[PDB]
Design a protein around this ligand. Structure first.
Ligand SMILES: O=c1c(O)c(-c2cc(O)c(O)c(O)c2)oc2cc(O)cc(O)c12
Length: 274
């Protein structure tokens, strides 16, 4: 028992998501990421089947961590007097999509297609497990550079999926939908599809389409890079001002732009010089 079943290594990063360190599980040398979150900085709390008070992030991760891929899995967690420590898997080598885009600029549509498809599969898995991420963006997507597999991270702004309206939100504003900005109300799926629209534009144009509230509310999409008509159409559809005018995940994946996706390994061999 006790939290010394892990050897601590360098700090990988730190921000609103806590402090994350590279580590190793001593029992079988497996790579892991160790996230530390201070209790005072956690606003949303839930409870596990057994009735213990834990961060919502732990509740959500447990719900999506059974089975396989698309989402980084929570392997274990610990409670300290002033923090919680989450043990997560550590693919390697890795780079998040924000950093990848910063370095390489706008992505070729074939690569954007493989990436976007994998994000859609991951988000669907979350929703099927009753989990809404609420902070889908490039920064929260890790790329396993060797396998070409994308993994969703940072469920610290998430919530249990529900069919009623959400009146609370603490994700990233520039990825938030017009109905949140104007009325402080949104439904889970349609808000998620809006964020996926921002993400897709971000991939093919190298930057997000909106910076100011006024731009989000207006919903006018200007393309700064050459992007195919089918891709523009999908983006504009995801970014419909009326939530009910947005596509379902099924409609997104049946869209003409999404056909003939590359498999993850092919994606890495062609685009991740792997
Ligand atoms: O699971 C995670 C993870 O593996 C990594 C990671 C892995 C690497 O191999 C790196 O080189 C690196 O910088 C980060 O970061 C994270 C950051 C989070 O906020 C949350 C996570 O769950 C992870």
């Amino acid at each position: 028992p006790l939290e010394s079943q892990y050897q601590v290594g360098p700090l990988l990063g730190s921000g609103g998501f806590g402090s994350v360190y590279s580590g190793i599980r001593v029992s079988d040398n497996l790579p892991v990421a160790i996230k530390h979150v201070e209790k005072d900085r956690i606003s949303d709390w839930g409870e596990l089947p057994n009735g213990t008070r834990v961060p919502m992030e732990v509740v959500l991760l447990k719900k999506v961590s059974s089975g396989f891929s698309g989402v980084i899995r929570l392997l274990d967690w610990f409670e300290r007097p002033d923090s919680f420590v989450l043990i997560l898997e550590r693919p390697e080598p890795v780079q998040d999509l924000f950093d990848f885009i910063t370095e390489r600029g706008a992505l070729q549509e074939e690569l954007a297609r493989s990436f976007f498809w994998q994000v859609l599969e991951a988000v669907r898995h979350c929703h099927n497990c009753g989990v809404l991420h609420r902070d889908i963006k490039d920064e929260n997507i890790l790329i396993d550079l060797n396998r070409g597999e994308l993994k969703l991270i940072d469920f610290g702004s998430g919530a249990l999926l529900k069919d009623t309206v959400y009146t609370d939100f603490d994700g990233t504003r520039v990825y938030s939908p017009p109905e949140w900005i104007r009325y402080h109300r949104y439904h889970g799926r349609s808000a998620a599809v809006w964020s996926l629209g921002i993400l897709l534009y971000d991939m093919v144009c190298g930057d997000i389409p909106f910076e100011h509230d006024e731009e989000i509310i207006r919903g006018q999409v200007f393309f700064r890079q050459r992007v195919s008509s089918e891709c523009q159409h999908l983006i504009r559809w995801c970014l419909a001002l009326r939530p009910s005018d947005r596509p379902t995940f099924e409609e997104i994946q049946n869209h003409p732009w999404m056909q003939d996706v590359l498999l993850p390994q092919e994606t890495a061999e062609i685009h991740l010089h792997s």
